[PDB]
Structure formats: structure tokens, C-alpha cells
Symmetry: D3
Subunit: 226 residues, 6 copies
Amino acid sequence: HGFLITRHSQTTDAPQCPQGTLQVYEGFSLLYVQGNKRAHGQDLGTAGSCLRRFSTMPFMFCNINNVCNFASRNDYSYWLSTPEPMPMSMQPLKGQSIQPFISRCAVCEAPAVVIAVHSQTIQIPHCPQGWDSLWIGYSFMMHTSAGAEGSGQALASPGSCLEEFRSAPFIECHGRGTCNYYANSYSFWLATVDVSDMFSKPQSETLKAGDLRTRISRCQVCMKRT
Amino acid sequence: HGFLITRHSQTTDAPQCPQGTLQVYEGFSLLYVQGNKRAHGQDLGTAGSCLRRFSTMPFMFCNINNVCNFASRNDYSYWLSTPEPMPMSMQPLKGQSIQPFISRCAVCEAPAVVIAVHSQTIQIPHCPQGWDSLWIGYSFMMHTSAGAEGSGQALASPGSCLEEFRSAPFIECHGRGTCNYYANSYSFWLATVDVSDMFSKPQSETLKAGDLRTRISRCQVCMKRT
Amino acid sequence: HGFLITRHSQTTDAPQCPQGTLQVYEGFSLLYVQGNKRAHGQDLGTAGSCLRRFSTMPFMFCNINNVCNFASRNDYSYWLSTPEPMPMSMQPLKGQSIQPFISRCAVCEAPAVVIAVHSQTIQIPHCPQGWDSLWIGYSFMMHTSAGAEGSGQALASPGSCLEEFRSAPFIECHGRGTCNYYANSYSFWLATVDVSDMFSKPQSETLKAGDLRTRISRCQVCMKRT
Amino acid sequence: HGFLITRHSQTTDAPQCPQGTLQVYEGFSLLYVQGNKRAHGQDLGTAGSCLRRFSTMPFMFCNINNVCNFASRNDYSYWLSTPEPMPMSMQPLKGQSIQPFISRCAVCEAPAVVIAVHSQTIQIPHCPQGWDSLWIGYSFMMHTSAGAEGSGQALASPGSCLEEFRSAPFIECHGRGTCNYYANSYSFWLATVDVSDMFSKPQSETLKAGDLRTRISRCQVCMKRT
Amino acid sequence: HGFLITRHSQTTDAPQCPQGTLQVYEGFSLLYVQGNKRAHGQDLGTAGSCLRRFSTMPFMFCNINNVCNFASRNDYSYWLSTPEPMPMSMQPLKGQSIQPFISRCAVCEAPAVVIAVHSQTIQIPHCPQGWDSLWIGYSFMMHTSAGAEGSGQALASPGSCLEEFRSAPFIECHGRGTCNYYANSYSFWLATVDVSDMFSKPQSETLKAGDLRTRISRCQVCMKRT
Amino acid sequence: HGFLITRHSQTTDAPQCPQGTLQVYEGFSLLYVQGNKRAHGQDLGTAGSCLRRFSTMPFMFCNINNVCNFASRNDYSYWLSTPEPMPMSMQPLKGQSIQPFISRCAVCEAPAVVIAVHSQTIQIPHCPQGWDSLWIGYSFMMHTSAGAEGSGQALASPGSCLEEFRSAPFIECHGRGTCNYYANSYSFWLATVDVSDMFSKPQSETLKAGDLRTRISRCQVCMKRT
Ligand SMILES: [Cl-]
Ligand SMILES: [Cl-]
Ligand SMILES: [Cl-]
Ligand SMILES: [Cl-]
Ligand SMILES: [Cl-]
Ligand SMILES: [Cl-]
Ligand SMILES: [Cl-]
Ligand SMILES: [Cl-]
Ligand SMILES: [Cl-]
Ligand SMILES: [Cl-]
Ligand SMILES: [Cl-]
Ligand SMILES: [Cl-]
């Protein structure tokens, strides 16, 4: 049997397929699109989040009168990003200067089902008995950007287990050909919760650089041993 | 092979895994979350809807300047609920008084694929030939609450087949640590339709206590016999 | 093993299940529903997009006070449609005159996993090595209609691979019993991108009848050979 | 000089114009409309909230291809309502049975500017020096219903000063010709605040019948003496 | 005394101020803007709808970290338009080719208050006793476009009384410098209602070229005689 | 005659009423509220934006079953703010520590109509002939925060003319009793446009501290001389 998963490097290099899986293709890490203001995501654990080719506008829309428009309005695409910093000017990137910002991915064929498990603690959870580890990460749940629109990940999916934590894990691109980070680009992570605190008022916390991971749930991606 | 499913008790007791499946873990029935007003759900048939630990705030958000905030705004979580009535005062629940309201779940490993089928009638549908029954229920399609935001279930998924019908099957919780039912918490169910009525104007109906199930589609959850 | 997929005819005839799969049931092509303004879709590759019975109102909602309302507000359903033209008057369709407009579907059991692959070009992509073709099509990503609400397809799913391209692939139906096409019913397709253009400003294009497919990505639906 | 204001009876009888103003016309109390999901209100203090003629569908929409549609989709109108109770069945009202539910209004010409003032207490505020009282009421700020869409009042306007407090001050009507109250129809009132509490954590309260007004700000409508 | 009103030519020529008013300035007819997906309109009867200078991007946004961005995302402006047809290609307009599409306006000082009255019939309503006519028109209530966002007019305001009926009375412009009409650009007009029909099911109608005005309410703009 | 306007100090001191107007009352600068996710603003030029008393929760909501809830969900209020910096920790403010952050206002009675005029340049516009200056400022058009919801100002109103430019002119408060600035709190300002550039592609710009005002339109608030 064959089950297809995606791995995201969060760098300009394609990731290696995990041990016991084989590579199908490599591409660019698509997070979601926004057309006519409506966001639609592709689960990061699935082949849909790995497009063979990048574009700031990877879709087009058609109206009921048989007229289609490509990159001819104000639509968006969103992509997982690399550690590349914003330029000092903080101006949107255009053309070739976009490339260093876009995460790469690989689609891999697994011989069995692949899942994520989440600890809701700072400790990496163990795979269920009979399952083997593929990778470890941080519990990535949802995101919003323009218009507070966005999408999210299935916690059962490898897409909810991002290998590198980033406060700004994705970049916003436009039909007009620009990309940038924006002040309202938010990432939402499964949080830690202590057993004694489950029913208590959550203890509010604002975390700064160096402490961000103290409240982020950890995860492992696991494949059934057959 | 192994395929993971979730069963929800809709009570304060964890459900038993259905015959022919084995238990992986138990948890609390997460329906969806709402961050920066945007709702994101976890399919009730999948492990993502079963969190090991409850919290009124099971996530945190981070901004592009490497500052994260936990339970420090006005965000929500939503959980499948129990038969526990609202207090007479109808005041939000805090602390330990939340526990009796939260549904429990179990994640189970099945040896084969698990599906839901729906009748669009008051009769329970039969499993496809070659599939065996795991449980029966009511066709649960979507829900909305605060800001009319919400999420839904895949009808192909066991998550669309809720074992106990409830007009109010889920409770709303807040980062501030409260939970309650609200007047705008809506549940949407796959409805019945008679064959002769498929193309006709739907006959509008308002149903009261005792008659609610007369227009709710029934379902069965089925596992492929291998 | 068994994995369930859906095929949509986009005609008033049920489609035949592809070679190597067996029929489970036939129905009507449900795209999404909209209740209390919130859209919720059923992935076109899954059994949830194939309802045994059509209705302009295939759901009902319940409030927390144990009162349910069926077809008693202003809610919507959306269905894949046929080549049937709008009447000259462009008035909404009622009753039996709706039937010629609604696409049919079949749910088929496959012996192995079924995926879609997308080329991002005008050429049909090839199935991965070890996978066999079930059908070819056009990369269908998302849609919006009333209130710019909508839903979309998973690119990994057969639901993202529509066999016939249509500018207007779906019709809007109402609880009141009417259906029609509307000026704001938009379809969004995965677009073509040339390798040399990936980082460049997308070349904006408005396409008219005869040229629409020049910028639509192609796809194939593939089943793992076991 | 002449300045036009509206008074709303919240009954099936037109209100009398206040002392020192003269009647222009009488009508029906329009609160807001909702077209293509988007709400648009008419300030209750202005002539726009007083339509000469009632209809469940008082508007029509046109598309860019010179086709207009009247009462041919799923649009709404909202009207201030009377003390008429919901029928026991809680079914939507149709036809002549709608009339007892709709508030009446009168548009009056004032010789000078007319304002509202608000106390943020259970005591009626006094008119500014040089202004005379026209009526007293309760501070009505905003409302939501279908899709959590809605509109509100300007606190400087007489429209923010509703003469009779009602938990359910408005009814929802549809293009299809029905009206009803719905569980998600919310009214928002300017609340009371004690001076010592301005910076403190607000003391959360759930109020039941008999106590609702204990936290509602009071208002007066005032006309400049010339 | 002085009260400022706006008149819109719906042509490339500035309108003349009505008899008994004097010109303050001339400009371009701004309908609304859309920033971070949120629409905000300027009442067409007020000076805010008459900008001295046109731009496809007449605003800029700032974030809390003292960084402002001008025309550097995917934001919109909307302007009342002229009778200029779409080019045959239906491609967005850029640069100088935008000018023929943009309506002009004049801001005029009136010696007294200026109102609109609406008939809800195909007959022009009369001004209230003591008020004189400035112009006649059609009852323009609201509009939506991208993301079904939009804004509307106050029926008490001259802005709700558009002198020329147009199915497509406004054009959409973008920060990137393009303008076009789009399939989802909707105009909403106060409709006609017969007295005998007020409580009846509205008679649904689809109107084509030549018949559009048969269901549009008429209006007059009136100034108090002092 | 009397016309009421509001002036906002953007400091912890009440502003003085401008020359030729007299004080009615002083209060706190309310920008908008957000209930059940829906934003509703009070025009900054009007008395509604000046509340006698501050509260993080200045409203309450009621449901159709005669139950009202005050500060018992996840609702917001937004207030114009002072130059007070965020604490270093960037944690939300509670209790008395909120006071230094909240702008004060005064409501003033003018003997004639008060307007704003806007230059769309870095130069302050002149009052129309026959009008006298009350104050000068910067053209403040709209704002968004939580859920990208927000409201805006009428450009004809003094509320669109803010006396001190601030990148972060408003603070977000919650029913739970906290206030803070958030990464997605955006302010939108009327921008400058050169005459030669009106029809050209807008020249995109990202401005940093020291240069922000280079693209902000200026305004004056003017009162008719009687
Ligand atoms: Cl675009
Ligand atoms: Cl930004
Ligand atoms: Cl929170
Ligand atoms: Cl409630
Ligand atoms: Cl309905
Ligand atoms: Cl239409
Ligand atoms: Cl309608
Ligand atoms: Cl209801
Ligand atoms: Cl822009
Ligand atoms: Cl279009
Ligand atoms: Cl609250
Ligand atoms: Cl933040």
C-alpha cells in the first residue's frame, strides 16, 4: 500500500524524506490561498501543501459568464517561510528577491498510515505502541493574516507538527507580485497545560524572545509499523 | 495496518473503544477553537478532536516580532458537552464547576478504514456490503456560535455520526476561564428528505421537545472487514 | 482493504465507477451548505459530497432551548451542476424544473488509496510510479457565492480534479425551494505557472470563451497498484 | 429652520410627535437590511428608519450585466417590534399575521437640533442647559442577528434612546415573506458603570426577568431651545 | 447658517450646485474604501464622498511599531462611475485610461438642512411642506463588492438619491493601480411596494434591460425654505 | 442654535473647548465596541465618542428569552489612547494601571455647523470662505483590530481630524477587564496624492519613524461664521 505525506524544510533546500519512506516529488510549501477575501488552506501533512511550482498567484477565478481573470484583482497566496530576515526597509519583496523566503517541501510515499501526536507539554510525546517515529516538532494549529482570514491544521495530521518553531512561520504574497510579513500575520500553537490547571483559570502570559517555547506543545510524527 | 478513530461519550466517562478496535488514549472532546475571531475545527472522527488535557485556552498566538500571548486576549475553545444542565442562574461556569460539562473521548486503532453512512431518513442506514457496524447515531453536520463562526464535520467521517442527539451538543469556553451555553450556539444536522419531495419546496417545520428527531438524518459508523 | 471515493458526472446521469473500483451507491453532488451565513463544504473526493437524496434544504438547525427549525430561515445549499443553461428570463428555478440542473455522483470502493496530482500546466500530469490512472481533469481549488462565503478542495483529493471544466460548475439553492446561478458565484482553479515565471510578477490576463483553459492547471486521479 | 427626527412607538399605533415639533409623515420602523450577507442600518433617530410602507423585502439588487433581482435570493429586513408574543408553535409568521408584530413611527420636524444624552446609570440624565426634554428612554447601542451581522445607533442620536426597553426589540423578516424571532437575535445596550468601578475588572452579571434594567443606561432626548 | 452637501454628476464633468446653494469645491466621487478587508464608506450626501484628488489608493495604514505602508498590500477604493463602457477585452484599466470612468462631484453650501425623501413607488415623492426641490433621483441604499464587503447610504441623506439609475454605478480600484467592474459588484436599491402587498409574500421578479426601473423607488432631494 | 461637537485630547487631561464654543461635559474617548464579533463605532466628532464614564465593558447584551449578560463573554471596547508607552513586559494592563492609557474628551456646543476639510497633501487645508478654524490635525479615516473588525470616521466630521498623529492611536479593552495594544491594531489615514499622480500607479512606500507624516493628509476643523 501507499500513503502520501509532505515534509517541509522551512528552508530553501528540499527536505529529505524520512527513513522508511520514498520520495515522489519536491516543491514549494503552500500554506493557504485567499480569493475574493475567502481563505482556503491545504493541510501541511498532505500533497496539496507541496506545489511543484511557486507563484505569488497560483490560482485564477472565473465568473458565470465564461470570463476568467488571472492575477487581475487583489488576491493572496501564503507560503511557509525560511529563516531569511525582512530587509531593513521592511518594503515588500518582488521578483527574484522572493526566492530566499520560500520554504521547500517533499512528498513522500509511506508504506503505512502517518499521524501526529501532541503532548500539550514541553516534552515530546511518544509514538503509540506499534508506531515508529519519523520526526519531532511543535504543535502548529492555525494562522490568520489579511482580514483575519486563515486556515489551520488537523492535529491528527503531520501538518500540525512543524519541525522548527517560528513566531513568523509564513509569508504573505499578492497577485500583484509582492510578498511580505505583516503586523497582523498571526500563528496559533497548541499550548501547554498542566494537569492540575485543566479546570482552573488559565494563567495569562506574555512571552518574549528566549521564552516563547515554554508554552508550546510538542509533537511527534509517527508511522504504523507493518 | 492501523487507522486511528475517535469516539465521544458525551458524558464525564471515557467511552469504550468499539469491538474490533484497540484503545490508544483517552481525553476530552475538542470541537473547535476561535482565535482572532477565526474558527478552526478538528474533525470529531479524528484524533485531533481528542485532547489528552482540557483547558478553556488550549492554544496561544505569536506575532511576527517574536512575542507570544497565552490567554491574554478574547479567544475561545469549544467542547462537546454532557447532559449536565445549565445552573438556574445561567451564569458562566468557572474552575472545577466546568468539569461536569465536558465530554470525554477515546482514540482507538482500527485494523481497517472507518466511515460514516447517512440515510437522510429517520431509519438507521445499513453498512455497505463488506463493512461491519461500530456504532449508530445522528447526522451532525456543522455548528456556529460567537460571531456566527464555526466549523463542521465530514459526512464520510465517524465525526458526523454523534451517538446521542442534543439540541445543545457543545459548550463555549473562554481564555478568561469561563464556559457557558449561549443563545446563538447553533447545531446543524443533516435533515430527512422524502424521495417524492427532493425537488419540491421543502416543507418548513418548527419542532419542539419530543419531536426534534422526526427530521434528523440517522447514521451508522462502519469498518471494512479484512 | 477498502477506501471510498466519489466520482461526479456533472450531468443528470450517474457516473460509472472507474476501472478497478466497485460501486457502493449513487446520489447527488453536494458541494457545500451555508447555515447562519457560515459555509461548510464536503470534499468532492469523499462520500460526504454524494448525498443519496437531493433537497434545496438538506439540513436543519437547533437552538439551545430544544427548538429545531427546518427550512424556516434564509439558508443555502450548493450543488455541482450540469450543462443545462439558465432560462432566458434568468428567474430562479423551482420544483421539478430544478432536476435538469443537478449533477449526479457515485461512491466507489477502491482496493487502495486514491489521490490527485496537479501539473500547474496545460499538460495532464503523470501518476506517480506505482500508481494507475482513474480519470483526468482540471484543478478545481475553491469557490465562493452568497456573502463571499464558500469552501474548497484538498489538492491531494480526487475532489480537486473535476472532469469537465465549467466557468459555472455549481448552482445555488435556498431553503425557500429555489435554485439559480448568481453574478457572484465564483470558481477558483489552480493556475498554470511557467518555471521561468515562478518569482516574476504574474502576467495578468483576462480570458474569454474559447481561451479559458489556457491558464487552468490539469490533473489526474491515481490509485496505488497493490 | 427645520431638522427631521423619528419617533418609534414600538406598537401597532403611530407615535405622537413630541411637544414643539410637527408631524411630517408616519410609517414603519426599519432597523436594518441584510443583502448578500452584508448588514446596513438606518439610524433610528433619522427619517431613513421610518419607511412609508412595510415589506419583508424593501430592496432589490442589480448586477453589472443590467439584470436586477427582487425577492429572488435569501435576503433580510429587520424591523423594530411590538409587545406581540411569538405564537406557541414558534413558527415563522406569514402574510397578515406579520402586521401585529411591526412597530410604527412618525417623522417630525423640529425647529432646532435634537440630541440624546446618556447617564451610564439607572437614573435618567438631564438635558444640557438650554435644551428641553422630548422623551426619556433606555440606551440602545447595537444589535446582531443572522450571521452575527448587524448595525447600531449613534449615541448622539435620538435613535440610541428607545422609549421601551425590550430584550427582543426587533424582528427578522425574509425575502421569501416570513418573519420571526431567532435565538441569535441579540440587542446591545449601553451599560451602567459606577465611578469607583471605571478602572476595575467589570463585575460579571447574568440578569433574569425582573432585573434586566438594573444594568441598562438611561437616556433623554433633548431639543435646543431657540 | 451653512450646511454642506455633495452632488455627484456620474460623468467626467463636475455637476452644477443646485439653485439656492453655492459651490465650495469640486472633486471625485468616493463611494468607499476597503483596508485589511474591512469596508468603510463615506455618505454620498456629505463632503467626505467628494475628494479633491483621485487615487486608486487614497489611504495608508500604520502598525503599532511606527511603520506605515502605502499602496503596499492588497487594498481597495471604490468610486461612483460614468457611462463609459468596459473595454471589449474586459481587462482592468490602468493609468490614464482610468480617468474616463470616474464620476465627478461638487460640494455645495446650503442655507438650510437638505434631506432626501423616498416614495417606495415609481412616482417621484413630493418634498415636505415648507421644503423646496433640489433634484430628483432613484433610491440608492447599499452596495457590496470584494469579499461581499460594502457600505450604504442614509435614506435621510441626499446620498441615497442618485440622479441617474445605473445597474453598475461604481467601479473597483486597487492599491496596485488597476480599476475594473467585477461580477460580484452589486448595487442595492430601495424597492417599490404596493400598499395591498405590504404584508403579503413579495412577488419575486427578475428584471432585464428596459424594465429595471419598474421596481426601483424614486426620491427627491429637498431643502428647507428659510 | 446649538450643534454639539467632541474634541479629544489624546492625553489624560480633558481638552479645552475651542474658541467660540462652550463646554457641555467631559469624558473618555470611546472609539468603538465589538459585541458578538461585530464592531460598531461612534463618530469621533459626535457626543457618542465621549462617554462620561470609562469601563473596559461599557455595554451588555440581551437574548430573546429575557436574559441579559454583562461582561460575561468575550467582548471588546476600544478607546483613543495617550502617549503612555506599553510596559516592557508587553503584558495586558488591569485595574488602575489602565487609567494612564485612556484619552479624555470634551463635548462642546457650537453656535453653527462644524466640519472637517482635508487637503490630501502635507499642507493644512484652508477653511471654506465664511468658516473659521477651530483646530488642525491629521486625516484619520478608519481602524481595525480583533478579527479585522473595526469602524471609521466621516471625512466631513471633526472626528476625521485627529490633532496628534499616532501610529497606535487606540487601545483594545476586554470584558474580562484587561487592555493592551495588539500587533493587528491598524490605523488607516487619508493619504497624500500629487495631482500628476492621480491616475498613475500609486508609488508604494514603507515609512519608518521620522518619516510617517510624509504621506498623511492634513486637515482643519472649521465652524461657519454666523
Ligand atoms: Cl490578484
Ligand atoms: Cl504591517
Ligand atoms: Cl484569550
Ligand atoms: Cl446568551
Ligand atoms: Cl432556510
Ligand atoms: Cl445575480
Ligand atoms: Cl430575497
Ligand atoms: Cl432559532
Ligand atoms: Cl494596497
Ligand atoms: Cl469578475
Ligand atoms: Cl465580555
Ligand atoms: Cl499581539
